[model samples]
Target: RIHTIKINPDKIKDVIGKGGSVIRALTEETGTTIEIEDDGTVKIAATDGEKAKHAIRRIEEITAEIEVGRVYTGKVTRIVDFGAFVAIGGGKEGLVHISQIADKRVEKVTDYLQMGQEVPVKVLEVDRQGRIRLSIKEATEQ
Candidate 1:
């Protein structure tokens, strides 16, 4: 059977760890197969339901403090005409579209964000694709 849990996408990388070290550790420690989604969902499959549940609970506890709509400071990693990639919490990244980069019209993403620029952003949405779309404008809204 597969046990599942809803987690915060921002915490996904931490669960994955460096080069999937955390997940490797979990499987080694629990003797179960674990899969995590980009949208912050987790699944554990094992013959032992109790063990799966325990692993899920432990991951939940570790990421309990992360929530959607919370603002996080992130660094710009890549820039394109339509958007910029920002590395947010847990070494994960979100796309800040041109529309969300500034209150005024931006001809290019570089006009607002440069590589390595730190900015505060709000999670606009965490989609089914497991990609996070963020908004600096929304973060500063009244």
Candidate 2:
């Protein structure tokens, strides 16, 4: 079976990754071949039926829109002094500020989170500059 779909041109970079790094890693890890065109037409190929489906699912993850008020399971990519960077989807990340980490005041952010930890989060805002701000506290309450 052949899988073909068109995505936003802007999302092309996310699926391709930096210097073909992301595409390579995904294909190798899942035993699939994914090709992208300049116009956002994607070609995903694999031998096994399950592998093909898995490849499409991964692509969907990369191309998913980070809409406000939506909840997503994101991974903790990095931790900073003020907040933690959460990779929401499609190689995009949002910041979960220290103040938003919990209802109560949080002193040390590291104590609350570690890198590669998966957590639930709600999309608080996507600024005019396209920066994403996430809310871990709100996600838990829901």
Candidate 3:
């Protein structure tokens, strides 16, 4: 079945992501074909309606704003020396810095998080540039 949804014209860039990487990820993940028009129209095509809806849900989740101080379950996508990147939803990731990964000192980021690990995290800040900063220790405190 094929279905379509309307969106803000400005969101096309966000939905498509940098270099269309995000849309590619969503399609790859859901096995759906999503076509977005320049006029804010989006088509979700899939043989499986459920899969299409799921993909739509993922898009909705991704395009929605992340509220600060909110808790979200995310998958750890990568670990760096300074922080671990956790994909909370919609292929978006927030950084859980070394200091934010634990209540105490974290000698190394890998000590607390690993790739593809699911963890509960709290949004500490969504900066002016739209970078999301997250904290696992803070989420645990809640």
Q: Give the per-residue lDDT of model 1 (tens digit) for 21-96.
A: 8888878887789877667889888888889988887786666434577787778999988899988766778888
Task: Point out the higher-scoring one by lDDT: 1 or 3.
Answer: 3
CA-lDDT, candidates in order: 0.81, 0.83, 0.83
Regions of candidate 2 where Cα sits further than 4 Å from its true position: 1-63
For model 3 the local lDDT of residue 77 reads: 91
lDDT of 2 by residue, 60-134 (tens): 866675678877888999999999999965687899999989878888789999998999999988988879999
Model 1: how far is 87 from its true place, Å? Answer: 0.7
lDDT of 2 at 88: 66
Residue 6, candidate 1: alpha-carbon lDDT: 79
- For model 3, the superposed segments whose C-alpha errors exceed 4 Å read 1-63
Better of 2 and 3 by lDDT: 3
Using Cα atoms with residue i matched to residue i, what is each candidate's TM-score against the true structure? 0.53, 0.55, 0.54
Each candidate: RMSD: 10.9, 10.6, 10.5
Native RMSD of candidate 2 (Å):
10.6
- Please give, for residues 1-142, the per-residue lDDT of candidate 3 as tens digits: 8977778787677788898999889889989999877679889999978998888778776768687777878889999989999996668888888898876788899877879788889888888887888988877764
| Candidates ranked by TM-score | 2, 3, 1
